[PDB]
Amino acid sequence: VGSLNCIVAVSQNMGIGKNGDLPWPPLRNEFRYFQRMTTTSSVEGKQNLVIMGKKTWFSIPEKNRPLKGRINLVLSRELKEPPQGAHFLSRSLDDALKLTEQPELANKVDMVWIVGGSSVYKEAMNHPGHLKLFVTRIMQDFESDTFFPEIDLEKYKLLPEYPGVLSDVQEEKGIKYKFEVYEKND
Numbered sequence: 001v002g003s004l005n006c007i008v009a010v011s012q013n014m015g016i017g018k019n020g021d022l023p024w025p026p027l028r029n030e031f032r033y034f035q036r037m038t039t040t041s042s043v044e045g046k047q048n049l050v051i052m053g054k055k056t057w058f059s060i061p062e063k064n065r066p067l068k069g070r071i072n073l074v075l076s077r078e079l080k081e082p083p084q085g086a087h088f089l090s091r092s093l094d095d096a097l098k099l100t101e102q103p104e105l106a107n108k109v110d111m112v113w114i115v116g117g118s119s120v121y122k123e124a125m126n127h128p129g130h131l132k133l134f135v136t137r138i139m140q141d142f143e144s145d146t147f148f149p150e151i152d153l154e155k156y157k158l159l160p161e162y163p164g165v166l167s168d169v170q171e172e173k174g175i176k177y178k179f180e181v182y183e184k185n186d
């Protein structure tokens with residue numbers, strides 16, 4: 001796999017979670033952006049793969065699990081089989097990417113999306129090679145108990161624009177936010 005993508009939404013105080021859910025109220029178009037980015041593939045015969053930690057998996061509503069139209073892979077050191085409804089289980093990120101090269105997934109995976117949590121993001125951001133970070137900046141402070149690791153600007157560049165990503169400040173339910181894309185190359 002020659003490229004990874006991470007996708008996250010983060011408050012001004014770098015918060016990404018509180019009590020097993022988002023720190024802010026549900027933002028419907030922001031969620032629709034997450035669903036569009038992670039689901040869309042124009043390559044016939046292939047699907048995107050989403051990779052997440054176990055707490056993030058259990059943070060998804062049961063009726064929405066697995067994420068539809070995507071291959072769902074959970075990372076866990078303790079499980080022996082995927083949680084109920086998930087497609088694959090791997091002991092680490094390196095192992096997950098290697099799994100995509102094996103027969104079952106060989107002709108099947110287009111893009112790879114890391115969708116949390118903290119430790120998964122941290123590991124992905126230091127992975128060698130090309131990597132993009134799709135970061136939604138929620139432009140307020142929210143009480144949080146889980147945080148996004150610092151973006152190393154020695155490695156990552158904020159892109160001035162990106163095709164298919166809106167550049168202006170957005171607003172839903174009185175909360176302002178903006179979509180950012182960062183890239184590193186190694």
Ligand SMILES: NC(=O)C1=CN([C@@H]2O[C@H](COP(=O)(O)OP(=O)(O)OC[C@H]3O[C@@H](n4cnc5c(N)ncnc54)[C@H](OP(=O)(O)O)[C@@H]3O)[C@@H](O)[C@H]2O)C=CC1
Pocket residue numbers: 007008009010015016017018019020021022052053054055056057059075076077078079090091092093115116117118119120123146
């Ligand atoms: N705002 C946002 O964009 C998002 C927010 N969230 C929020 O974040 C919180 C969940 O995230 P968080 O608490 O950080 O937990 P994680 O989703 O990272 O889950 C932690 C568990 O996942 C497994 N795991 C994590 N990394 C690895 C690894 N490298 N290799 C093997 N297993 C691994 C371990 O399971 P085990 O112990 O079984 O080995 C670990 O105990 C929730 O509040 C959720 O709502 C989540 C995603 C995005």
Ligand SMILES: COc1cc(Cc2cnc(N)nc2N)cc(OC)c1OC
Pocket residue numbers: 007008009030031033034052056057059060061064115116136
């Ligand atoms: C892991 O799956 C989900 C993750 C999120 C958090 C999230 C929300 N927005 C963006 N841009 N990235 C994210 N990772 C939000 C969700 O819905 C509100 C999810 O589905 C239940």
